[PDB]
Symmetry: C2
Subunit: 473 residues, 2 copies
């Protein structure tokens, strides 16, 4: 009940300074992004697109390090506690937004920024009310109360909100039947619901909601013709609006479905959301190049999966085949499941894998998929592989040819988040002497506060205090 | 033949300088060590041992970054090409030691160091002739020809060789029946085969070989009472011998069985070899603190597995249980398989898991192990989980209680190496301004050459050339 021997030299006390001040702050969260994902996308860009990934160029030149992602009582965080660490500077229990397990509210960073006259933008491929954007602006004991969070967004009044989640705004979907779109319009927001409307809009403040739930994966947008915006298209609309504001601005961009694809154990969906993020990176760095008063932070909130390209063949000499084998993919497991519906036949499964993964399943493999979808019978199991039926789908298309991968030699530790430290990267003018090393995720809060002159403190709870509360729940 | 678009900004062209010069050099390789391994050990030290891992303290303070580990024709390397990148500064085809795929020999760095008058030590928990040490000193087209490597070690003449591999020196074990211990003794080497002999010896130069193959895992040494040295004990014998040499010294220390544990999918065995490495780290950094003419490089050669502590329980709130569930473990899967012999009964499998992993196997789980050991029937399969029967043993003790882990909630992407970039850390005097970022693993060669003023070059082979050669095999 006091600190481990050596605490004065641990990662928590590693609090490196920027040594620079800024007027604008962009925070680009790669949700669920692991170093295995990085390696696959890095290789894919070079080998299959003959290009160097923009993220590789940044990690090869600009200050970067590592964050610990553990939450207050668990060595594996989820998104609200991770976002809270960023936005509030303190460890919380998994589950609440800018709040402690006892209900103590915290003040998150973009709320502080708005109070200081910065415009605020939230842009994501998740529901716009999801944990990562929401943890930066509002407090709520239940991350999943997104119908209420949408109301909190209206009252908070950020200049730009872009993402998914029509189910939380549309009077025909909300449980209370309220037309929140109308209420945003009454406060002067331009409301947009398609890519076309988004780009055409000349409204200064924007609410854009482009899907019932999360925005589709890049792989599905790209190859299945879905009329939804890319993350890039959403940033292109937000950035000039925020930049026009006299008092400066803060923006969160979230590549929020990297996490989701990693949950499915779908390496091809992960890759395309990482590649979609890379296009955004190019946009954001070009903006910072033109705007040296602006700091860009690129950070993963935790690892998920993790989905590693693994050694294949004699002396692992065939390991790169798994990268090639991603290029034929044309849809995610999520879209496949949608296509297949609730009572697919083995023959239909087999065709879906052929058409959308480039995979020729054996009878017994397609049958496993049928059982998982129809009878909730999972293979090999459903605890370590806790996301179903997608994880059974991944195992159904496992590599069989040990001499040379016939299907991607990418495996998965789990269908859940992992405890690995993950990427933290700074892109800005004058940071050459910043040495990050391994810091705590709460240090992202300190960096944001230093950059903008918005350092303040939020209350702390000890691990033992939190465990007692959790015992009593 | 042409380089990818953006190659001038890639990680290969990130070649940061030490800006300091040294007399001695210690290279500490964590073989197969991933960021998931790191998170588990970091958590175990704090939560179960009440202390901050020395490696945590180092990453929280001294310059560290990442290395890309891919080899010349594969995005997943093995240990010989990884070592060559370090010791020779060029990419090679997996399998050869300090040699290209067409038989072109390369000059590895410790050979250059000896030519320049440095004493040389190799200390490892693998067989002393294994790829990571051997790649720093000798050339050989086949990393597996360790009987010949042992002969090459005789002419190389390193001041200290310590590790496993009696099968490669013992006249009763070598195919050619030749008594290499006698040959090393003839050259003035003290020969030691046990920890007591090692500590008692006053020989200036040392050959110490402590097991028939690899040295036992730390967990087995520690709890099964085996009479073999720890990595620390081996380093304690080597370091003062090397430090006495007037011309300075180079030393490789290898925590070489982190890799093997991750291959097994045995998280408890991985933990204890990481912790054993951590004790050595404390020893090496104290040596550097007293000898500022000495640089310490700490580096993983690639990730293996990988074995991630994953989200378990409601809101992942029970995920730290897996860390706790490691403390009752008392042996590795390798030691357990030794005990179980070739025709175990389920009841004996069930007893081994109880006594050595603290796991209560169901009847069906115990039977899967028997079938794996006796019939080479593997579950769930044997390709993604390519290390058997150990990977089946891991799956036999998978977590079953989804509300709160009853066995460690640690999962594995595979039984093989992965593509993920890994740790590179510098511990020395005067490096506060070194910003590493993501570099190629071949940069370790440039760092060693800079450190000692021994820069030279080895010939490069192109990926196209290499692929041609491999075709024609
Ligand atoms: Mg998120
Ligand atoms: Mg090794
Ligand atoms: Zn997340
Ligand atoms: Zn998640
Ligand atoms: Zn290795
Ligand atoms: Zn290995």
């Amino acid at each position: 009940a006091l600190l481990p021997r050596g605490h004065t030299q641990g990662a928590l006390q590693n609090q490196p300074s920027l040594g620079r001040r800024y007027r604008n702050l962009i925070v680009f969260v790669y949700d669920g992004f692991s170093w295995e994902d990085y390696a696959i996308a890095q290789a894919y860009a070079r080998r299959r697109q003959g290009r160097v990934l923009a993220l590789e160029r940044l990690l090869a030149r600009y200050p970067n390090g590592l964050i610990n992602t553990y939450s207050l009582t668990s060595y594996v965080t989820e998104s609200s506690a991770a976002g809270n660490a960023f936005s509030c500077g303190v460890k919380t229990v998994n589950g609440g937004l800018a709040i402690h397990a006892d209900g103590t509210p915290l003040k998150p960073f973009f709320a502080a920024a708005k109070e200081a006259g910065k415009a605020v933008g939230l842009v994501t491929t998740t529901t716009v009310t999801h944990a990562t954007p929401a943890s930066f602006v509002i407090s709520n004991p239940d991350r999943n109360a997104e119908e209420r969070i949408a109301e909190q967004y209206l009252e908070f009044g950020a200049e730009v909100y872009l993402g998914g989640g029509d189910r939380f705004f549309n009077p025909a979907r909300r449980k209370d039947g309220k037309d929140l779109y109308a209420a945003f319009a009454a406060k002067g927001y331009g409301v947009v619901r398609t890519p076309e409307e988004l780009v055409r809009s000349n409204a200064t403040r924007l609410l854009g909601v482009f899907a019932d739930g999360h925005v589709p994966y890049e792989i599905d947008r790209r190859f299945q013709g879905l009329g939804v915006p890319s993350l890039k298209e959403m940033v292109q609309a937000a950035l000039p609006r925020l930049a026009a504001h006299r008092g400066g601005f803060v923006l969160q961009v979230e590549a929020g479905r990297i996490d989701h694809a990693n949950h499915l154990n779908d390496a091809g969906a992960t890759l395309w959301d990482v590649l979609a993020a890379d296009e955004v990176l190019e946009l954001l760095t070009a903006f910072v190049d033109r705007n040296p008063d602006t700091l860009l932070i690129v950070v993963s909130d935790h690892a998920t999966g993790v989905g590693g390209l693994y050694g294949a063949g004699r002396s692992y000499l065939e390991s790169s085949q798994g990268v090639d084998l991603l290029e034929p993919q044309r849809a995610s497991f999520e879209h496949m499941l949608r296509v297949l519906g609730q009572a697919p036949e083995a023959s239909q499964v087999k065709e879906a894998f052929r058409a959308m993964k480039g995979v020729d399943l054996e009878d017994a493999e397609a049958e496993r998929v049928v059982r998982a979808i129809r009878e909730k019978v999972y293979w090999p199991e459903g605890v370590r592989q806790g996301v179903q039926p997608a994880n059974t789908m991944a195992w159904a298309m496992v590599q069989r040819d040990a001499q040379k991968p016939d299907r991607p030699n990418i495996g998965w530790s789990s269908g859940q988040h992992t405890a690995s430290p993950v990427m933290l990267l700074l892109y800005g003018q004058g940071l050459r002497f910043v040495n990050l090393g391994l810091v705590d995720n709460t240090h992202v809060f300190r960096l944001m506060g230093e950059a903008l002159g918005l350092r303040y403190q939020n209350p702390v709870m000890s691990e033992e205090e939190a465990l007692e509360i959790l015992k009593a729940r």
